[PDB]
Every structure is written in C-alpha cells, then in structure tokens.
From a paper:
Diatoms rely on fucoxanthin chlorophyll a/c-binding proteins (FCPs) for their great success in oceans, which have a great diversity in their pigment, protein compositions, and subunit organizations. The light-harvesting antennas of the diatom PSII belong to the LHC family, but they bind Chl a/c instead of Chl a/b, and a large amount of fucoxanthin (Fx) instead of β-carotene (BCR), to harvest blue-green light; hence, they are called FCPs (fucoxanthin Chl a/c binding proteins). Lhcf proteins are the major antennas for PSII, whereas Lhcr proteins are mainly connected to PSI, and Lhcx proteins are considered to be mainly involved in photoprotection, as some of the Lhcx proteins have been found to function similarly to the LHCSR proteins in green algae. We report a unique structure of photosystem II (PSII)–FCPII supercomplex from Thalassiosira pseudonana at 2.68-Å resolution by cryo–electron microscopy.
The structure is a dimer and shows a unique organization, in which one monomer contains a PSII core, one FCPII dimer associated at each side of the PSII core, and three FCPII monomers. Among the two FCPII dimers, one is a homodimer composed of Lhcf7 and associates with the PSII core through an Lhcx6_1 monomer. In addition to the protein subunits, 191 Chls (183 Chls a and 8 Chls c), 29 Fxs, 10 Ddxs, 2 Dtxs, 22 BCR, 2 pheophytins, 4 hemes, 2 plastoquinones, 2 nonheme irons, 2 bicarbonate ions, 4 bound chloride ions, 2 Mn4CaO5 clusters, and 69 lipids are assigned. The unique organization of Tp-PSII-FCPII is largely different from the C2S2M2-type organization of PSII-FCPII isolated from another centric diatom C. gracilis, or the typical C2S2M2-type PSII-LHCII of higher plants, or the Tp-PSII-FCPII particles solved by EM and PSII-FCPII in two diatom species solved by in situ cryo-ET, in that the major FCPIIs in Tp-PSII-FCPII are dimers in contrast to the tetrameric or trimeric FCPIIs or trimeric LHCIIs found in other organisms. The LHCX-type antenna Lhcx6_1 was found in the PSII supercomplex and located close to PsbX, PsbH, and D2. Lhcx6_1 interacts with the PSII core mainly via D2, PsbH, and PsbX and bridges the Tp-Lhcf7 homodimer with the PSII core. Lhcx6_1 binds 11 Chls and 3 carotenoids; most of them are similar to other Lhcf subunits. Thus, the Ddx/Dtx cycle and Dtx-dependent NPQ component may respond to stress in the Tp-PSII-FCPII supercomplex under high-light conditions. As shown in Fig. 2 (A and B), Lhcx6_1 is located in a position between the Tp-Lhcf7 homodimer and PSII core, and Dtx303 in Lhcx6_1 is located in close proximity with the Chl a402-c403-a406 clusters but is deviated from the direct and efficient pathway for EET via its Chl a401-a407-a408 cluster. Therefore, we speculate that this Dtx may serve as an efficient energy-quenching site in Lhcx6_1.
Numbering used by the authors:
A (entry chain c): 21 to 470
B (entry chain e): 8 to 83
C (entry chain j): 6 to 38
D (entry chain k): 8 to 44
E (entry chain w): 178 to 231
F (entry chain f): 13 to 43
G (entry chain a): 11 to 343
H (entry chain d): 11 to 351
Amino acid sequence: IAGRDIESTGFAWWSGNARLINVSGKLLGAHVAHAGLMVFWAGAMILFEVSHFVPEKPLYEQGFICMQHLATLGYGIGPGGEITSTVPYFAVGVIHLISSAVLGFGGIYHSLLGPDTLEESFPFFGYDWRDKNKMTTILGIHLCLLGLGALLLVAKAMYLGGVYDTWAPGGGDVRYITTPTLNPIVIFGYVFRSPFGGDGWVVSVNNMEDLVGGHIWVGILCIVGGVWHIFTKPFSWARRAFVWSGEAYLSYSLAAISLMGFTASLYAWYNNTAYPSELYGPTGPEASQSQAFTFLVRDQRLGANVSSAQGPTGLGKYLMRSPSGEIIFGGETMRFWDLRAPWVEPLRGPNGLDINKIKNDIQPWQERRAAEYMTHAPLGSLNSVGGVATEINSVNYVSPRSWLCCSHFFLGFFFLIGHWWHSGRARAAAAGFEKGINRANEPVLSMRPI
Amino acid sequence: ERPFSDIITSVRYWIIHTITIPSLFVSGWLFISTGLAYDVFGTPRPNEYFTQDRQQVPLVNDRFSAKQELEDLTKG
Amino acid sequence: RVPLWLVGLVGGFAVITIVSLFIYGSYSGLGSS
Amino acid sequence: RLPEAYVVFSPLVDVFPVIPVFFLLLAFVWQAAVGFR
Amino acid sequence: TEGTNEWFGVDDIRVLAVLFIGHYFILSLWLGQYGNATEDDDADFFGEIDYTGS
Amino acid sequence: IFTFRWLAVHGLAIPTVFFLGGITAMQFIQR
Amino acid sequence: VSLWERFCAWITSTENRLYIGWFGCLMFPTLLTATSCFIIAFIAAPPVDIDGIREPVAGSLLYGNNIISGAVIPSSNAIGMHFYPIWEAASVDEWLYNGGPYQLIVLHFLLGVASYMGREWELSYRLGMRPWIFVAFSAPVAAASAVFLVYPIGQGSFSDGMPLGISGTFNFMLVFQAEHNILMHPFHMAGVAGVFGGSLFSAMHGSLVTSSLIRETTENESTNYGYKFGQEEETYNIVAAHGYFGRLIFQYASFNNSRALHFFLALWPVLGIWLTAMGISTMAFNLNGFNFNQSVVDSQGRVINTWADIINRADLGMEVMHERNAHNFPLDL
Amino acid sequence: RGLFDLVDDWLKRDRFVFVGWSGILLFPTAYLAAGGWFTGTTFVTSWYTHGLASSYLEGCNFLTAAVSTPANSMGHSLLLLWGPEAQGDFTRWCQIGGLWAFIALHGAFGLIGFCLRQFEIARLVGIRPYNAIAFSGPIAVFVSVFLLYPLGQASWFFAPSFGVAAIFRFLLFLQGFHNWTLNPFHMMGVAGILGGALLCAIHGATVENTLFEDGDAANTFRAFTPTQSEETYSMVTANRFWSQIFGVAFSNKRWLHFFMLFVPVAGLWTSSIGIVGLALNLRAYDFVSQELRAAEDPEFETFYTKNILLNEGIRSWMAAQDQPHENFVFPEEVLPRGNAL
Amino acid sequence: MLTLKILVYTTVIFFVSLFIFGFLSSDPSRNPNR
Ligand code: CLA
Ligand SMILES: CC1=C(/C=C/C(C)=C/C=C/C(C)=C/C=C/C=C(C)/C=C/C=C(C)/C=C/C2=C(C)CCCC2(C)C)C(C)(C)CCC1
Ligand SMILES: CC1=C(/C=C/C(C)=C/C=C/C(C)=C/C=C/C=C(C)/C=C/C=C(C)/C=C/C2=C(C)CCCC2(C)C)C(C)(C)CCC1
Ligand SMILES: CC1=C(/C=C/C(C)=C/C=C\C(C)=C\C=C\C=C(C)\C=C\C=C(C)\C=C\C2=C(C)CCCC2(C)C)C(C)(C)CCC1
Ligand code: OEX
Ligand SMILES: [Cl-]
Ligand SMILES: [Fe+2]
C-alpha cells in the first residue's frame, strides 16, 4: 500500500517511523499514544508499590522510587518521616490508570482512523515545518501550559496542604511555606553559580523558601515567554543561524533533555532537601560522616579527650582543620566537609564544629541516626547484595539513590548521542548531500591542490 | 538439497520428531533424577562432601597409588 | 504448512521459558545462598 | 496492602507494571505479520 | 576565594570591565558587516537554509 | 538417510536435548 | 567587502594545510596549553601530596624516576572537588605542593577533545560528505571523560582519578578491581568482546582483501605498486573471496554487500566501547558487579568454595594493603 | 583410476561444508574437545583436586563452572585413560583431572587441522595463503600459554582452567606473583590489540561515509550490485579529509589492508615471547635502583612501590587457599595489613 | 595573582566570543551546494 512500503518512500521497516515526517495526522496519534503509555506506567507502578507495602521497614529498605515523591509532596506522612496511611497513593494511581484509557483511545483514533493530513480540513491545527510563525505559536502555547504547571506547584506548596520540610524546627513535618523568597539576587545567584565543589550550581538549594521562590520565578518567566513567542516571529539574527526542519527541532529538543537528565541524576545523588534522607536514605558523604561521628562518640564515652588525640600520620584522629580553617571530622572523610544535615547542625558554631557542644551536648537520637546511616550506606551489587565488594550474602538492599542516578545518567548519555546523530543528519539533508557524493560534480576535484 | 526452509514444513518430519524428542528429554530427566550420574562421574552428593570420620578436604597426594587413595577417601 | 512467522514464535516462547526457568532456579534452590 | 475491598485483584496488579513492554514486542509481531513490507 | 558563590567568579570590577571589552570588540567587528539588517516583510524566505545573501 | 548433513546435525542435536533435559531436572534439586 | 567577511572566509577555507574552522578556535589553544603544561610537569615537577596525609609522592624525571614509573600526580585529597586554579594559591610553590597541574591539564584537555569532535564534523560538512565519523570518535572521548571527570564526581575527589602515567594506570586498575569487582560486570565483558572482535575482524578483512589481488606486478617489485591513486577497483575479487569465505565455514554466512560489511565493522567496537564506558560511569556511583560469595552449601550447612571465592581472596589481599596510612575506621565508605 | 584418485575426487567435491583431506584430522578432534568441555562443565567436580565445586550438578551457574586442572601430585603425566594412574576406571580418571588433558590434547590437533584446512581451501580456489599466517597468531598464543607455561612450572596444576571465573583467577594470579603488567611484552600486545580495534572502526566509518550516490532512496544499503567494476566510495575525498584533519592519510589500498592484517598478529606474537619468558620465572619484577634508594632513604615513594605492596598483599592473602596441597598455615599476626581495615 | 586572572579572563572571553560570533555569521550557507 502507498505510504507504507520501501518502494514508495525508502525507509525500510527497521526505520519505518520516519515515514511520518510529512504526515501530520498520524504523528499526533503516535505522540498521544506514547503519552498514554507514560500515564499508564505511572499509575501501574504506584499501585504495584502500594500492594507490597510493609508498615515496619523504612521506605528505602523496600526498593520504592515512586512512593517517596508523593510522601515528599505531603501525602500520608507524619512527624519524623513515618507513613500513616496509603489511601492517597491508591487514589493517585487509580486516577492515572483511568486517564490512560482516554489518552490511549484518542491516540488510536487520531492514528488509525482520522485524516492523514490536517492541512486541508482543520487549518488551525496545521503546519509545514517551515512556517516559523506557526512553530513559534505552538511553542508559546505549550510553554504557557508549563508555566501554569509551575504556578500550580507553588499553589500546592503555599495553600493546599503544604509540603514536607526536613529542616523543620523539631524534626521533619508537613508545614505551610508562608514567606517564599522573591529577591532575584538569590535565585539568579543560584542559577549563575559555579558547579565545582563548595558551590554545586543548582543542586545546592538547601531550604524550602528558595525552592518555592524559584518555582514562582520560573512560572512568571514561562508565561511571559509564551506570550512573547506567540505574538512575534523570529528576528533576522536567528533566521540566518538555524536550520528550519523537523529533524533539526528534534535534535534541539534532544540536547536539552540530555542536559536535564544529567542534572536530575546529580540531584538524586547529592541533594537532601528535595530528597529528604528519611525517605531515600543517606547520601554518599552522609554515611562516612556518620561513621566518623559514631566512633568519636564511642571513644569519648570510653574516656578519651577527643580533641588532642593524634592519628597515625600525626594529623588528628577525630578532628582537624579544613584548608580554609573550619573544624571538621578527621580521617579519609576530610573530602566531604561540605556536608550539611539537620542532625549535625546542632553541633556547628560560627567556625565549624563546637568543641564544648561535642563534649557534653550529644543526644541519643543523634547517635541512633548516625548508627543507622552508617549501617545503611549506598553500596551494593547488581543482584542486590549490599555492602562492600568483598562481603558475603546476608542482606538484600540497594538504595534507590544509586538506581535513579545510574539509570538517568545512562539515558542522558544516550540522548546526547541522539543530539549528535539526528542533528548531523538534519543538517546534511538540508544541504542536499545525505545520499552520497555526486559523481558527476565531485567538489574535491575543483579545489586547489594541497 | 531440499533446504531447511521447507524441511521445517514437512509433516512427516514433525510427527517423527514429536515421537522421538520427548523420549530423549525424559531419558535425560531420569538420568539426573535416578542419581546414576553421581555414580558414573563420581560427583559427591550434597550430603557426601564430609563423612563422619573425615572432616577435611580429600586431596590426592600420590601419583601411582591414586586408585587406593581414592577408594580410601570415598567410603573406607 | 505452517507459515514462517508462527514457528519462530514457538521457538521464541520455548527459549524465553527456558531462560526464565534458569533464572528462577538461580534465585531458588541449589546455589541460591 | 491494598484496601480491603480490592485485595482479591492483587494478582492482576502484580502484572500491570510490565504491560508497556509487551507493546514494544507487539510492534515487531505486527511487522512480521505483513512479512516485513 | 574558593568556597564563596560570586557570579561567574567575578570578585573585582576590572574582570567585569575586560569581559565587556571582549564581547563588545568582537560584537563591533561583527556589526561592521551584519549591522544593516532589517525586519521588513521582504527579507524573509521559504526554505530550510537562508540563502538570501545578507 | 546417510548424508553428511544428517550425521552432523544429529550428532550435534541428540546430546543437546539430553543435556537440556538433565539441566531442567537439576533445576529442582534441593539440598 | 568588510574585514569580518575576509576573516570568516579565511577561517572556513578548505585550502589550508590544516583545517581551522570555528571549532578550531576552541581546539588549538586548549590542546597547546595542555601539552606545554604536561611536558613541563612530567620533566621537572616536585613531589605532590596526593592523599592529604602530608606524605608527598615523587613523579618527575628529575626526582629519580624513569619513563615507566613517571607520572603527573592527581590533586590532593584535602581539596576534594574544589576548583583550584593558580590564582587561588598563596604562592606557586603551594600550588605545586597540592597537585595543581592535574586539574589544568585535565580540563583544557577535555575541552580540546570535544572541540576535536566538532572540527571533524565541520570538515565533513564543508567537504560535502556524510556526517557520521565524529559519532564513531565519540566512544574514546566518552571513555576518557568517564574516567577522568565522572569517577571523581561520583567518588567526591579529584584524587581518585586516573594518574597521567604508565604505572599509575596499573595502580588505578588494581584498586578499582579491589573496590568495585569489575570483571564481573557485564558491561566490561561487552567491552572485552568488542576489542577482541574488532581485532579478529580487522585481521580477517585484511587477509581476505590482500589475498584477492589481481596480477599487475610479477616478481621484482613490491605488490603495493599495482594500485594507483585514483584507480577504479572494488576492494576484493568477488568469485575467489566469496568462494573462500563460503567454503571455510557454512555457505550461509558470507557478506556479499560491501555496505553492510563496512557497517558491521564500524558498529561492533564502537558499541562495545560505549557499553564499557557506561559501565565505568555507573560503577562510579557504587553499583558494583555480580556477587557470588559463599553461594554453595552442603546439606549440613557448611560452605563449599568456588572460583569466585578465590577471586574474593585476591580482592581482600589487594584491599587491605592500599593506602596503608589513610584509613582510621573499619569501613572504607 | 585407483583408490587414491577416487577418494581425492570425492573429498574435494562441492557440498554444504568443505571436507578435504584435512577434515579427517579436524572434525573428530574438535568435536571431542567441545563434547569434553560440555560434559565437564555439567557433571564433573573439582572436589578432590582443588577443593572446589565447578559443575551445574553441584550448584554453579554459567559464570562459575569450569573444567579444572589435574592435581599437583601428578606433575607432567599425559594422564591417559589407560595410563598407570587411572588404569581404566573412567570414574577415577574423571576424579583425578583427566578431562583437562583430554580437552587440551585433542584441541591442539584440532587447531592444527583448522590451519591445514585454510591452506587447502586457499590452494583449491587459487589465492595466496594470507589467512593461514593470521590464524598462526592465535595458534602461537594458545600453544605458548596453555602448554609451555605449565611445562616450565611444577605441574599442570598451574595452567588456566577452561572456565569464565578461572580465567579471571589466572589474570589476578599472574599479576600478583609475576608482576605481569610491568613486562614490556604484554605492553606491545596491548598496543597491537587496541590498534586493531581502532583500525577496524576508523575504516568502516571512513568507507561508510564516502559512498558515491548510486541510488535514489535513503537506504544506501540497496544501492550496490553484488559486484561491479567501479568502487563504491571516493578515495580522493577520504585522503583529503584525513590529511586535513589528522595531518597524514593513506593513499594505497593494498598497504592499508596489509597494515590491518599486520598489527594484531604482531601484537599476539609479541605477547607469546613474554609468556614463554615467564614460564622459566624470568620475569621483570624489580627496578634495582629504586629498591636500593627506598631501602636507604625512608622517604622515597613512587607508584612503583605502591604496586609492589599490592602484589605482596595479593600473594600473602591468596596463597593459603589457592594452593591447598601445600598445607600453608598463616597465623593472623603474620599477615601483612595496613591500618584500620 | 590578580593580573594573571585578568589576563586569563581576557583570553577566554576573546576566544569564546570568536566562536560564538563565528557560528552566527550565516554558517549553514557555507556548503559546496551554495
Ligand atoms: C510508541 C510506539 C509506536 C507508535 C505509537 C507507532 C505508531 C505508528 N507507526 Mg510505528 N513502529 C514502532 C513503534 C511505534 N509506532 C516500532 C518500534 C517500529 C519498528 C518495528 C515501528 C515500525 C513502523 C513501520 C514500518 C510503519 C509504522 C507506522 C506507524 C503509523 C501507522 C501504524 C498503522 O497503520 O497501524 C497499523 C496496525 C494495525 C492496524 C494493528 C494494530 C492495532 C492496534 C494499534 C493494536 C493495539 C491496540 C491496543 C492494545 C488496544 C487499546 C484499546 C483502547 C480503547 C484502550 C503509526 C502512527 C506506519 C506508517 O508510517 O504509516 C504511514 C509504517 O509504515 N511503524
Ligand atoms: C525552579 C527552581 C529554581 C530555578 C530557577 C531558575 C530561574 C532557573 C533558570 C534556568 C535558566 C534560565 C536556564 C537557562 C538556560 C540557557 C541555556 C541552556 C542557553 C543555551 C544556549 C544555546 C544552546 C546557544 C547555542 C548556540 C550558540 C553557542 C551560539 C550560536 C549557535 C547556537 C544558537 C546553537 C531554583 C534553583 C531557584 C530553586 C529550585 C526551584
Ligand atoms: C568426553 C568423552 C567423550 C565425548 C563425549 C561427547 C562427544 C559429548 C558431547 C556432548 C555434547 C555435544 C553436548 C552438548 C550440550 C549442549 C548444551 C548443554 C547446550 C546448551 C545451550 C544453551 C543453554 C544455550 C544458551 C543460549 C545462548 C548461548 C544464546 C542464546 C540464548 C540461549 C539461552 C539459547 C567420549 C564419548 C569420546 C568418551 C570419552 C569422554
Ligand atoms: C490494563 C488492563 C488490561 C490489559 C490491557 C492491555 C493494555 C493489554 C494489551 C496489550 C498487550 C499486553 C499486548 C501484548 C502482546 C504482545 C505479545 C505477546 C508479543 C509477542 C512477541 C513476540 C513473541 C515476538 C517475537 C518476534 C517475532 C514474532 C518476529 C521478530 C522477532 C521477535 C523475536 C521479536 C485488562 C484487559 C486486563 C483489563 C484491566 C486493565
Ligand atoms: O582515596 Mn583513592 O581509594 Ca576510593 O576507597 Mn576510600 O577513598 Mn581512598 O580508600 Mn579506598
Ligand atoms: Cl577513614
Ligand atoms: Fe578498502
């Protein structure tokens, strides 16, 4: 049949989805069907995780990656990070699962029965991959929708129940964020920060006020940009620099999504504000700091004065100074002195750790938390063994942080490869020599000899 | 000649194979389940690694008297 | 007269069930710690 | 555990998460049905 | 220093001045050839690559 | 009935089925 | 014309001895400065305190090394992942004491190789070719970036990166084996298969093409002189080579299409290297290989060993002896 | 004519698989070696020689099963089934480690037969025999390690075992005891292997990205008749591209393919020499000057000394279980160890 | 130390501006099929 064979379009079966480039009716159905599949997976995963829940173990000992997001949003969590009920998770899963059916039916209809092209009966929903005005209009519309979503998150954080705050005065609890920060200096110093150690770029946000203010500013910027890109057309300096075709737009999107994937993986690895440690588990540095704290406490209880104890190299077994002067934990964990956790801040003064507070102000709950985080470090194997590489089979645990980081890092790299491939092909096809070298007029033969 | 592409289709091929193959599969299953392999190849059984007398690994120490050493180590 | 896209399906089912059985035996029984 | 009114449907729930892959396999099956046209 | 969070690493006015000098010098050289552009509705095109001279 | 392909394919195929049956039987052994 | 137009015409000219392009503007200075710093540091650098325990390690030729054991030591452990340029040290001596040159060399080098990929694409575009060679080159770049940058980021310190030396590479490999149990990660097996298959196919293809040469030289001259620059001849003799390959193994396995052949040749090692680079990158976040320690037991409950247990003994031996004076607590987290 | 001519005519007929005169040596030996490996990894144990379990019947998986070397008490015996050690009795022959010798001995002749087959086919079709020197490479590797290394050592016990994890054990063992990474022959072997991989990728992308436009569809695969006279890609364009990017490029199509043939075979033949050297404990272990200075000056340190300490740790912590027949007993107070862990 | 930082920033911004304004000068038009 025409349009579905190699003899009429090229594009053999293993690259058959490339026959939809100039068919704007079936492309809509395909994209809608993928969206429906995404919604279906979300709902099904929520339900599956709910079905296996055990009310004794913490969430990071059961291999969950979906319940933690809802818990952080402020659903079914209590003081300290304990799960009280699972009804809201069930409701979210059911709603997603039901909406998936409507999305899938729409995709199937628009793909299998609707008109092949929309440029003949619905002029509003039509394009040519080269009409810049229409592309800007579509971009502005969907951009305004993104801005509305960000403002919806802000509204949930401020009025509709609140969000879980791990830095709360008295342990993690759900609270209303009533005073978001709006000074552009702080937000755009977060944006324009260096990514190296000590700064961390945008991963280093460490309170909820900055988070809410940033999502506010993002909503405002997205709405303004959507209106602007709707009411205008590309300027002269942009027309002479870009390639105007569908594959070029695909490559442009691919590069940005790869960058986003890398950023999300590093969020999951390093941050502990949007990813509270009571639900996901301790971060990499946190386990080592906990080990040092635990052994300091034990040795102090035995009778040592842990400020003048000399290590094997003469550097200080328990306490030392960072290259800038602050008092930090000794040992090999001197590299992680940038850590800030709610269970350590009680012992920090204006110039690092406080000697007197360490001496006679350590509470048992801090000791318990340190022991737990020391014994639940994010180390494991592919077959879910847990521990150092030279350990025996006794436990079965791999932290969700490692899974999330590794998976989205893998995806980010492969989508960067996508930028490279799809963009190179797009530009070569636009120029007009993606099929091969024209043997009649080989350009190399008319160049000055080298 | 008569390539595989239409050998895969002949009904007589299929019926004789359905007659023959399950006999071989069941023969292998019975070979394992009877315990005859343990005797053919000398592989120790899960309760035969250590006997009541010998509580260490039975390594062979002699070249020309391996038969007697193995006979001692197995049961005697 | 089976067409050459169903017998391949049977072979795929056989190989996938054999692989699944081997993985399950890896997770349970001898050599499962 | 699911709410008590739905515990009976647990085996179906234990299979839903993997459905989105069977779609990818079904695409290949459909292509093979028409003989890789 | 090292651990502070200044924008782009700028800690003095001279750094900002020289950054402006660089961007502006190359910008002036570029404007020497692309400075006479217009946004009228006759300099546009309909294609994938802009071959409309300048 | 005595062609070279017959001998090769059957010599490679019979022990394969025997060993596969043996492995499937092994899968259910428990100490 | 203007001055800018003449400059642009000279930059993108395809008549220079070496193509410059717009990517070359980022390429040349970074690679040149990295080369200069590397040579100077390799010849005449003072000892560097790598572990932060005030025990400097010598790595230069003038301090009693040879070519095999010389290296450029990674930065100090006290620094961590902090940015350490020259102007952040109180003096050049302090900068050299804490392992300054490593960061400079690594960063300008990575920028240079990225620009190298870009420049390859740019020349392909200017010459009217198909733009998929830099995609193939992306695999070694991915591996080098993986090690040099990604492993420190995951482990939290530049001091855990691969030293720029020969014996430093072996040290890095051994410690990585001890700590993460590589050789049991399937991605490493994919990489090993990739390199072995690449060598196999290179040898096979070379032999097949060389054996199928037509007669143009007789005895008293090298056979290479038969080919002329610009000659027209497909890179085999179809009858002889195809018959040889179809007779050596079963006749069903023979590539009669040059396109598919030279595609498979390109695809195999590149995919292998991509997979092994991603294996290293994922192991940087403590997702180690398979663990099969003490998995076989008898009826009573005693443990019967396997080869994996011998590998574990070797790993323990490596682990207990590395960085002897650097640890204070029982766990190496 | 005579029997010889009739048999010769029959052996070289066009069949599904070429048989030839070398088939008599090739087929039985290779078949027996493969069958021996398959039965050894499935039914036989290593309890009485190594103290290990190495079969599926015992609980191992694909990555941990192997056919282990014979016991150390049998130094260099050929281990024939009818020899003075087994005296028949298939069971005892399996228990003492005869399957390893069976596999190795029949497999060496299998490799010889395959090389002869390459020679015979090349002569039959009338082309120069270059695929038989390229295979001689791997023959050298196999012979060198699997036969010469044990023959210079105490017994067959110190040979690689036919398994996946056993090869990893071999790698770690040679690194720990011989300092094999420092030998200047494994270095050249590594260079050859990596260069071969590099050459394979650069050529297929260079060839695939200079194709002449001989078609109309985006699928350039179906634009090549099975064999024509013209080349499918432009040599001049590739030469220009690589000489302007890298500074040097190929211009002769025969030298290119000879280089592709030459690099990996040279690497393998180089590594074989180093393995033969290790067979007699003639290793490259110490730099005497650095050892003397470090002994005199307790502040001189390089990566070399760190690798030496790592090797010492490997040896001390592995020898106890790696060689069960020596009855090594190391108290905890003599094992080398750093601080803390 | 400050003057070294000034010079390094100068060089970096100069080369980066060269790159940025070089790719903005109607680059897709510079192909042999013009
Ligand atoms: C997310 C994955 C996805 C999606 C959405 C699509 C979508 C599409 N592909 Mg495609 N494809 C995919 C993956 C995908 N593909 C993959 C992985 C391959 C490689 C094997 C291909 C190879 C391929 C080729 C070679 C071609 C397409 C074509 C098409 C288009 C027409 C298909 C058609 O006529 O259906 C015909 C199929 C059927 C009538 C049978 C399927 C019936 C339904 C869809 C089965 C599922 C029903 C569902 C289970 C029940 C839901 C009920 C609901 C009420 C809840 C369509 C837009 C064609 C095209 O371009 O058309 C112009 C084309 O030629 N694709
Ligand atoms: C939400 C939030 C936040 C944030 C906020 C914000 C505000 C953000 C922003 C963001 C942004 C704001 C981003 C941006 C980006 C940009 C970019 C990314 C750009 C790029 C560029 C490009 C891509 C270009 C390119 C080129 C060149 C180079 C030249 C010429 C050619 C071209 C054009 C191609 C915070 C953190 C606060 C907190 C949390 C929450
Ligand atoms: C030793 C000996 C001998 C010999 C024997 C034999 C010859 C045997 C054979 C045997 C055999 C010959 C066996 C075989 C078996 C096989 C098997 C056991 C197979 C399996 C398979 C599998 C399991 C596969 C897998 C896979 C893959 C690889 C890929 C894809 C997927 C799948 C999964 C399918 C005799 C008698 C002389 C006597 C003396 C001794
Ligand atoms: C949700 C829900 C549900 C479900 C539904 C669904 C959505 C389903 C559908 C869908 C599905 C789930 C489908 C799937 C199917 C698939 C298949 C089953 C496939 C197969 C595959 C194969 C076997 C393949 C093979 C092959 C061939 C054939 C050729 C080429 C090669 C290969 C190998 C690829 C129900 C009803 C329960 C209700 C409730 C709710
Ligand atoms: O830095 Mn370089 O090697 Ca990674 O594990 Mn911990 O930290 Mn130290 O020890 Mn082991
Ligand atoms: Cl430590
Ligand atoms: Fe060639």
